């Protein structure tokens, strides 16, 4: 559309122009601020709306801060008992994407609200930043709107922790659709490796 098209095109080019300039300054501000910052404006209004945005009470956008790096596996210098093929602390990586990690941590604190989806709002060198859509179920406006009334349903309670979010699908191998993707689809435990 409008500026929605322009901002999308800017955000392609992370390293360049207005996108680098504005956000580089802002991510320095974010370090000073806590890991809880609620904001009343979407940083990306384009991708808020392509993940479900209606501006209307009960809808919030919120910032999550989750570190950059690999994985931490407890008790280094007292390292695991087992054959050395599983000896590794920083060698290992999480199999969750950090987009979903942001959702899980945000949902832990904000248990009275429910995660819809999340998106990326840059990184520095030791923190990775995401803005997350949470929308209340307990407020009237969501119930009396028929485009989001599916969220209210008890089945979708804490869907982020069960990995049923957009982010949760992608790390679960549901990114594809057919063959090769086939061992991910209805469960990894579907055949139960029989």
């Amino acid at each position: 559309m409008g500026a929605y098209k322009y901002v999308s095109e800017l955000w392609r080019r992370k390293q360049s122009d207005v996108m680098r300039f504005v956000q580089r300054v802002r991510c320095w501000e974010y370090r000073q601020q806590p890991a809880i910052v609620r904001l009343t404006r979407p940083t990306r209004p384009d991708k808020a709306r392509r993940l479900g945005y209606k501006a209307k009470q009960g809808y919030v956008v919120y910032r999550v801060r989750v570190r950059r790096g690999g994985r931490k596996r407890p008790v280094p210098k007292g390292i695991v008992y087992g054959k050395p093929k599983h000896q590794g602390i920083t060698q290992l990586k999480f199999q969750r994407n950090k987009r979903s990690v942001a959702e899980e941590r945000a949902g832990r604190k904000l248990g009275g609200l429910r995660v819809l989806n999340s998106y990326w709002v840059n990184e520095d060198s030791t923190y990775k930043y995401f803005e997350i859509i949470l929308v209340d179920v307990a407020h009237s406006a969501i119930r009396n709107d028929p485009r989001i009334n599916w969220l209210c349903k008890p089945v979708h309670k804490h869907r982020e922790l069960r990995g049923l979010t957009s982010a949760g699908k992608k790390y679960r191998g549901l990114r594809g659709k057919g063959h090769t993707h086939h061992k991910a689809r209805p469960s990894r435990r579907a055949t139960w490796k029989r």
Binding site: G2, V18, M19, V22
Partner: peptide, 30 residues
Amino acid sequence: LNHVTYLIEQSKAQLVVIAHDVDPIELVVW
């Protein structure tokens, strides 16, 4: 935003008055 930008494309708007500010600076550079 969406209304006014469409008017620029159609050339309906004679003059537009644009804010200096606005927190997403990406929005207003366009």
